[PDB]
Write a protein that binds this ligand. Structure first.
Ligand code: HEM
Ligand code: HEM
Ligand SMILES: C[C@H](O)[C@H](O)[C@@H]1CNc2nc(N)[nH]c(=O)c2N1
Ligand SMILES: C[C@H](O)[C@H](O)[C@@H]1CNc2nc(N)[nH]c(=O)c2N1
Ligand SMILES: O=[N+]([O-])c1ccc2cn[nH]c2c1
Ligand SMILES: O=[N+]([O-])c1ccc2cn[nH]c2c1
Lengths: 413, 413
């Protein structure tokens, strides 16, 4: 009938009836093929497209309280007709909106889903050139940033048609620091972007060899070739790291951008695919303080912040790592708050997710969730989410990962 | 052919060829039916038993460097013969040892598996009364404790035969604090043992209504009825919590037992089942400091330790929880060290697991691992394990969970 789910903290039980609407032991795999929707060089076979199309249309119309039956049956018809004549179909603006929030709502790895319904949608389905793509992206960044009071938004570019005419942002995220190697062997900046940074250079980008050099937007439009554009500095707002007690913190010269916008995901809805549709929320402290700043494959500042705190950085058992990282997190949080830039700590984040999750079950008997992702990189069991049992399942609409575009691309020149 | 596994920190890749020897999306489920081996009231059907028996015998003999072919073929015969005559068979002591270490080695949720080969085995297959069971358990506790220098060990009781003659320790762990309700509504001691504590009372136990009252051993032998025995206080060694800087820590009057011994798991080997075989390792700081001491469904001391540290325990964004829990962990570690009682911090734990894991892959192309379990309840991404991808799979031998014995038990009186 369904599946019981226990919350080992409050002891409460839940019944997941929603997992039945899924699709089709890989525990800690980052990019499983099950979560990726790759390239195709032929349209989406009519027999496949039509059913998904109807389902989605029945979902949309089956969502409002005062159900408009006429419009529903009518739309269904107009839809199938459009499919019979052109092949693929076009969603109403209202539908696309509904599609983008559901896809978010249905994102197993997102902690900030309580906000699902509060999203801004930028309809860029008219776009046709990289230059126009770049202009929309700027409008996005400018809107989302809002002088620190971050606003969630998504810009939808033209849906995949035949397959050779895909719109694709080659970047992982909109704003993202560059990572250069160095003569003395040491890596500089974000070591994770080493590969993509090189690529930007190959595409004729001028590497200002620094620690926080905002990478260039590498845009591809209508299956064309990738054109490079530098993000207008006036658009990239950044916060300067500063500890509320350690005056030596600013001496670390750290800072991070305020905009967390995922750029390379595909939106799947009603059997239609949107290879390019960047979106953004706002940061959760631990993302910067723990991942970005502390990971040994990123800025890796833990040992540096350690000794300056005067700790036995050579005795693991002293828990210096535990103390240090926490002070970094304090810095990140303090700084975003001080410089009036929206941000949320992970504890608060979790409590809001738990609240969210309840609403999801009451409202629709389920809520897809990846525990491995949903639990904060620090102070795990201290947050409620650690204790919540949860089922992970790919519903629809959905935001899938895509194969890295440079790997598969018919190059023009 | 196999499965690539990436370690997102060192970037290194691994090939898991071992998952092929497994048996047969449930992400964060604690007690999945896939990990439980329940009751049965009929022997283990010969056609099932014989194949598993041979496999195991081929495993055992296929483990030594200087392979003794004669003894091998010979054993195989003697084995099948014993099966044809009696039904179930008896493992050689050497085999049982090999069986208990492999089962450990094959434990997906154990962080301390680098020690797998270093285990003490107590052969209590001769046991036949609760009184004798209790005596062996004491020998165990006494051996393992070793005046603070903890030693890993396991005591194997008689294997399941027909099913109505099962040997079973009703406790979750050997040493374990009691949890009583209270007139004023407040819970006292370990709130997790509320159920089992009551049971002990029903079985005529004298509840000394305290915070750290070591529960009674509830033993069941040869399908008999559960008899209660109090653990001799001289046997239960405990450490007194004490912070190396905050003199007010001891004023908290906290303490914890040094022996972490899992009591209720079933050992499966060569198709034979051992419903009772408690084992023990030594603690990993976070287990006590974070789980036992901080969980809102245990001792829950986080807020108490908070205000005494002088923190804004009413402003979540202050990260007081992060600071507090860490100091508790410092206390737990400091105290076990000071009172000369073996213990290992989680950071050190992780590095040793990573080392372990390498050996496992090089030595046998695989290593079953539950990331959700293997990653520390605090400072997740700070430890290497967080970044390691890993496959979870039930091999054999194996330590399965069992259905709670009180739920399914043909009561005599
Ligand atoms: C409003 C505040 C939001 C917060 C606090 C939030 C927070 C997070 C966090 C912590 C993650 C994991 C990030 C990582 O470790 O890489 C995440 C992932 C994700 N979020 Fe949300 N998010 C927000 C808004 C959004 C919005 C508006 C969308 C989309 C419309 C979204 C879609 C997703 C997706 C698809 C992932 C997974 C990304 C991946 O697989 O790498 N998020 N978010
Ligand atoms: C020598 C030191 C050892 C350490 C540091 C260690 C540590 C751990 C930790 C941290 C867990 C998770 C505990 C929890 O959250 O409940 C665990 C689980 C486990 N360990 Fe090990 N362990 C050790 C020895 C052993 C031995 C000797 C065996 C068995 C022969 C063993 C069998 C297991 C099993 C079956 C689990 C899973 C228990 C469950 O599912 O609740 N451990 N151990
Ligand atoms: C729901 C979730 O699986 C559960 O609360 C967890 C997660 N991982 C764990 N990890 C360890 N070490 N111990 C546990 O009890 C749990 N429980
Ligand atoms: C191997 C493991 O899945 C990986 O390193 C993880 C785990 N969970 C995560 N959780 C978040 N939030 N972000 C991540 O990148 C990861 N990566
Ligand atoms: O907008 N997002 O997709 C997104 C992704 C990751 C994080 C982390 N903090 N905030 C985020 C928002
Ligand atoms: O012996 N064990 O099965 C076991 C189980 C859990 C823990 C936690 N620290 N040490 C342990 C040993």
């Amino acid at each position: 009938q369904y599946v019981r789910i226990k919350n080992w903290g409050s002891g409460e039980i839940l019944h997941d009836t929603l997992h039945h609407k899924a699709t089709s032991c890989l525990g800690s795999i980052m990019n499983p093929k099950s979560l990726t929707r790759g390239p195709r060089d032929k349209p989406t076979p009519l027999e496949e497209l039509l059913p998904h199309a109807i389902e989605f249309i029945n979902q949309y119309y089956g969502s409002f309280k005062e159900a408009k039956i006429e419009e529903h049956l009518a739309r269904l018809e107009a839809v199938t007709k459009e499919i019979e004549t052109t092949g693929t179909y076009q969603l109403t603006l209202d539908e696309l909106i509904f599609a983008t929030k559901m896809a978010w709502r249905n994102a197993p790895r997102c902690i900030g889903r309580i906000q699902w319904s509060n999203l801004q949608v930028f309809d860029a389905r008219n776009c046709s050139t990289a230059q126009e793509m770049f202009q929309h992206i700027c409008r996005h960044i400018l809107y989302a940033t809002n002088n620190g009071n971050i606003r969630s938004a998504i810009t939808v570019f033209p849906q995949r048609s035949d397959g050779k005419h895909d719109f694709r942002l080659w970047n992982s995220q909109l704003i993202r620091y560059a990572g250069y190697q160095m003569p003395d062997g040491t890596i500089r900046g974000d070591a994770a972007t080493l590969e993509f940074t090189q690529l930007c250079i190959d595409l004729g980008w001028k590497p200002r060899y620094g620690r926080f050099d905002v990478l260039p937007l590498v845009l591809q439009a209508d299956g064309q070739d990738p054109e490079v554009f530098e993000i207008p500095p006036d658009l990239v707002l950044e916060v300067t790291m500063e500890h509320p007690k350690y005056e030596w913190f600013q001496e670390l010269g750290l800072k991070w951008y305020a905009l967390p916008a995922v750029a390379n995901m595909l939106l799947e809805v009603g059997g239609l695919e949107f290879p390019a549709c960047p979106f953004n929320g706002w940061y959760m402290g631990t993302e910067i303080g723990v991942r970005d700043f502390c990971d040994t494959q990123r800025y890796n500042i833990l040992e540096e912040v350690g000794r300056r705190m005067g700790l036995e950085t050579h005795t693991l058992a002293s828990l210096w790592k535990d103390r240090a990282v926490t002070e970094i997190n304090v810095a990140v949080l303090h700084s975003f708050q001080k410089q009036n830039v929206t941000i949320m700590d992970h504890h608060t984040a979790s409590e809001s997710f738990m609240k969210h999750m309840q609403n999801e079950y009451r409202a629709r008997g389920g809520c897809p969730a990846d525990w491995i992702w949903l639990v904060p990189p620090v102070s795990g069991s201290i947050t409620p989410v650690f204790h919540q049992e949860m089922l992970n399942y790919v519903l629809s609409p959905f935001y899938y990962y895509q194969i890295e575009p440079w790997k598969t691309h018919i190059w023009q020149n």
